[PDB]
Amino acid sequence: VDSLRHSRSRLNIYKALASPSLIALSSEDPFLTAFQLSWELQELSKVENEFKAEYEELSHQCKHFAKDLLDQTRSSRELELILNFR
Amino acid sequence: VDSLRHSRSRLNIYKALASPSLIALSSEDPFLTAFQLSWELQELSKVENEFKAEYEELSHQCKHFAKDLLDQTRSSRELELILNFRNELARLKLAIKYRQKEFVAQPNCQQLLASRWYDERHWAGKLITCVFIGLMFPLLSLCYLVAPKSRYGLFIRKPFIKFICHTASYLTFLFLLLLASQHIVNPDRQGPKPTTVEWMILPWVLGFIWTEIKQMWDGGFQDYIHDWWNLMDFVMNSLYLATISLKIVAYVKYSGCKPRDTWEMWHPTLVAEAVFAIANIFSSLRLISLFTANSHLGPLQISLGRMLLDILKFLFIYCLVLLAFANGLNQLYFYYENSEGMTCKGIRCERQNNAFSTLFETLQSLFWSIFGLISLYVTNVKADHKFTEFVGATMFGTYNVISLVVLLNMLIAMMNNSYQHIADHADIEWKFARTKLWMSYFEEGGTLPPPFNIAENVRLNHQYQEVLRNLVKRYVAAMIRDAKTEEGLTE
Amino acid sequence: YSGCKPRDTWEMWHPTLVAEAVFAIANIFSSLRLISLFTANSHLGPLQISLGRMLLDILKFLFIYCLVLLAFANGLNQLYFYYENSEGMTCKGIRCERQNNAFSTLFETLQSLFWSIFGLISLYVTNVKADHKFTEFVGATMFGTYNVISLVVLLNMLIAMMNNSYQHIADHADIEWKFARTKLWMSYFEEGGTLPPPFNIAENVRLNHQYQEVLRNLVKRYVAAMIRDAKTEEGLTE
Ligand SMILES: CCCCCCCCCCCCCCCC(=O)OC[C@H](COP(=O)(O)O)OC(=O)CCCCCCCCCCCCCCC
Ligand SMILES: CCCCCCCCCCCCCCCC(=O)OC[C@H](COP(=O)(O)O)OC(=O)CCCCCCCCCCCCCCC
Ligand SMILES: O=C1CN(c2cn[nH]c(=O)c2Cl)CCN1C1CCCCC1
Ligand SMILES: [Ca+2]
């Protein structure tokens, strides 16, 4: 019915979810949420084609968060525990 | 008298008027003032040519103000109350008329139009459904004009479907054009009779001319001739008319079935064929404009079309060099026009000869050497003068160096430098063009392809004024009060 | 088929000839696959990835060029199709020593308009055996206009597009190259193929403890470093 409000609400929610602090506060596995959220935003970038830039930037920042979180490692054993998990 | 004071006073006044706060404080309709002020400043940019930058920047900021004011909308009903104020979508038509590109390509404005255009997938589905609607166009176009009731005749009024139908009609016309030049569908008899394909082509030509006349009464030789595609339509329709009026002259005057080889130049049939071919070129070339509706080929086409007023100036500078060297090279060789027992003379023969004997041949020779199609033995005479044959070869070589190592690379450098200043405002331009394409199909004026073609207001001011008051209040609170506290610090 | 007939006096579509043609076209691809070997090098890798990323931008341009080609072919075939002499000619077409009938059919017209991007179509192909110096001028002007549009306008716009695209690519270039090299390597870490073609025919719950401890430390370090120690380096405003 009201497409304008629907679009704003969806974008506001997705922009809230793709936040490093909200992920680092209440999330069972930061890497899974970053991966999945980046994929969802990349997909939505092609449906809501009127707002491509917003979704592309949000997915880009979700990609940079996982890399920044992997830089806080100070041992090889500590890195192998992450890259080998299943 | 005192031009300096007059200029300062006029610029100061206009710079005061084009101020977002002064407009938002004392103005009966912000959008009208923004549109009109932007147009006035754009016009003054060409009279007071000593101060172009000032007026251009002021008009640009007046354009950005209207867009920023349209972003303070939080409902679809609230947006439709603005775009429909005054028939349907009158404000959007006014904005397109005033060339408000930033206002038109707004994301929320660009979504209402999409919803009004599609009215109900992936790539394969959109590929395979658009073929099924375009194959069966004639029966829809036939059942619309007999019983326009809610069974099948209201399915050709939807803008997307109408666009598909017109595309299918144009593609059928192109297929017939490709089919006209076949050795199965007539021989060469002097002053012939139209074949089975000319009679099918004639109704599309008539329909195209009728659509053009309809569209040219409405505009009135102003901003209709601006659109270059309409100019091309005019030229090709002129050529088609000239083709009709020569196939008849050669019918009522000439006849007799003479062999083709032993005809004589300017025979009306040959000139008819020449004009028809040159018209086919334009008719087929008009198929580029179909792809301003695509999302990938659209922006690229707009960018290509914007780098054409910068190539024409360069070609005009090149023609002067061409004429100078032709004048030089014809003065040297015009005493040697042998043409002694030669079946063919000129450069368009197997053994090229007399390449610089006349001015016309000289221009042709200097043109076809941009592509390397003029051999080097054309700078020889039957005598044994190894001094004019050296001056001529040096003139030819200097022309080649100036034309293919200096002017071409400067054209490349110019185009590279221009393309960067274009590819920033590229999506705004493309969406403005796509919006014009769409708006041409929202009305029940044509609604039919060429082959088958031959108070009520005072109450609404209350809601509109309420909407403007809220929009102005939101803009003041957001832009000129909440983004002034984010500037930097100084001494 | 069998019988040892001489090669010259065969007939087209004889299966041996088509076998040879398909075999040659397959050799081209097989030899071309040798480019992918050099995503493992450190110098030729990034350059190859950059070349391969500027190909979806050339295809669109070629699609716009084919429309111009088709328009001018449609124009040029309409003018010359009445002059298909072919009178006592051993060879006809443009792939012969004396080129002839360059615009007599649509297929030859497309071929003629293609081979003139490289300058291999002579200029005497715009003549007829008659003496009509008006169609021979309209045809030469059509050919010249095609040459100008194709070799002075569209080519330089392709160059400008490629220059403008290459700068937006050469920033994320090493990320792309290392991602590609990593995929190449990972394809050889398992014992699946392990053999070239010629000779080819709780256990988890305990670990969640260590993984959770590692995540807790990583999240704590990230919070301390990024969203608490790099927020005190912003600028000042009003
Ligand atoms: C790799 C880049 C290629 C560029 C080539 C440039 C070569 C320059 C000259 C090299 C010398 C070789 C000549 C020897 C042969 C010979 O003697 O003979 C002269 C030959 C001509 O052929 P002939 O041998 O039959 O005489 O070559 C020449 O005519 C040389 C002409 C050079 C002209 C240079 C002009 C400079 C451009 C200035 C800018 C103009 C501004 C625009 C005005 C509007
Ligand atoms: C250094 C850069 C080189 C560029 C050369 C440009 C030259 C331009 C014309 C020079 C005039 C010489 C002609 C005189 C000879 C003659 O009369 O004869 C005409 C000859 C043809 O050979 P003939 O002599 O046999 O007729 O040359 C021509 O046909 C001129 C054609 C010019 C076409 C210009 C088109 C402009 C491009 C517009 C953009 C298109 C947009 C893309 C659409 C999708
Ligand atoms: O709007 C026009 C005008 N046309 C004219 C007019 N006058 N003379 C001519 O030769 C021609 Cl082709 C037909 C092409 N189109 C569009 C129809 C929908 C698909 C994209 C093209
Ligand atoms: Ca038109």
CB distance C211–A68 less than 8 Å? no
Look up tokens 């969640």; give the residue.
Answer: C208
CB distance C214–A82 less than 8 Å? yes
State how far the Cα of C200 lies from the Cα of C192, in Å rounded to an integer.
12
- Close Cβ partners of B480 (under 8 Å, ≥ 6 residues apart): B20, B21, B24
- Are the C-beta atoms of residues B198 and B248 closer than 8 Å to each other? no
Look up tokens 């304008």; give the residue.
Answer: A4
Residue type, B187: P
B244 to each of B77, B205, B240, B247, B273, how far by Cα in Å?
Answer: 54, 10, 6, 6, 11
Ion ligand 4 neighbours, Cβ < 5 Å: B 230, 233
Q: Which two tokens stand for residue B380?
A: 């020889």
Q: Which two tokens stand for residue B466?
A: 């309420």
CB distance C75–B420 less than 8 Å? no
Cα C133 to ligand 2 centroid, rounded to whole Å: 19
State how far the Cα of C82 lies from the Cα of B269, in Å rounded to an integer.
12
Q: Residue B297, CB half-sphere, CA atoms under 13 Å: how many? A: 16
Please name the chains neighbouring C, where neighbouring means 3+ C-beta pairs under 8 angstroms: A, B
Resolution to 1 decimal place, in Å: 3.2
**Looking at ligand 1, which residue's alpha carbon is closest to its atom 26?**
B394
Q: Which residue stretches of B119-227 are H helix?
A: 123-135, 137-144, 159-180, 198-219
Q: Residue C147: which of C125, C178, C184, C115 has the closest Cα?
A: C115
Residue C49 dihedral angles phi and psi, to the nearest 5°: -65, -40
- Are the C-beta atoms of residues B156 and B141 closer than 8 Å to each other? yes
State how far the Cα of B244 lies from the Cα of B232, in Å rounded to an integer.
19
State how far the Cα of C154 lies from the Cα of C198, in Å rounded to an integer.
48
State how far the Cα of A10 lies from the Cα of A58, in Å rounded to an integer.
13
> Ligand 3 within 6 A of B208 CB?
yes
- Close Cβ partners of B214 (under 8 Å, ≥ 6 residues apart): B445, B446
The SS3 call for residue B423 is coil
Residue B233 dihedral angles phi and psi, to the nearest 5°: -60, -40
Nearest-atom index, ligand 1, CA of B395: 29
Instruction: Report CA torsion sign: A73, A79, A81, A84.
Output: positive
Chain B positions touching C236 (Cβ under 8 A) are: 488-489
Find the CB nearest B288 among C67, C106, C153: C67
CB distance A4–B75 less than 8 Å? yes
Reduced 3-state DSSP string for B348-390:
CCCCCECCCCCHHHHHHHHHCCCCCCCCHHHCCCCCCCCCHHH
Please name the chains neighbouring A, where neighbouring means 3+ C-beta pairs under 8 angstroms: B, C
C175 touches A at CB < 8 Å = no
Look up tokens 């041949």; give the residue.
Answer: B361
Look up tokens 């602090």; give the residue.
Answer: A21
> Ligand 3 within 6 A of B54 CB?
no
Look up tokens 């609607």; give the residue.
Answer: B133
- Are the C-beta atoms of residues B111 and A3 closer than 8 Å to each other? yes
State how far the Cα of B86 lies from the Cα of B361, in Å rounded to an integer.
62
> Ligand 1 within 6 A of B394 CB?
yes
Cα B370 to ligand 2 centroid, rounded to whole Å: 10
Q: Which two tokens stand for residue B389?
A: 């044959």
State how far the Cα of C147 lies from the Cα of C145, in Å rounded to an integer.
5
DSSP C184-224: HHHTTSSSSS-S-GGG----SHHHHHHHHHHHHHHHHHHHH
* C230: number of Cβ within 10 Å: 9
Nearest CA in chain B to A2: B76
Look up tokens 């590929």; give the residue.
Answer: B127
Q: Which two tokens stand for residue B137?
A: 């166009």
State the binding site of B for Ca(2+).
212, 215, 230, 233
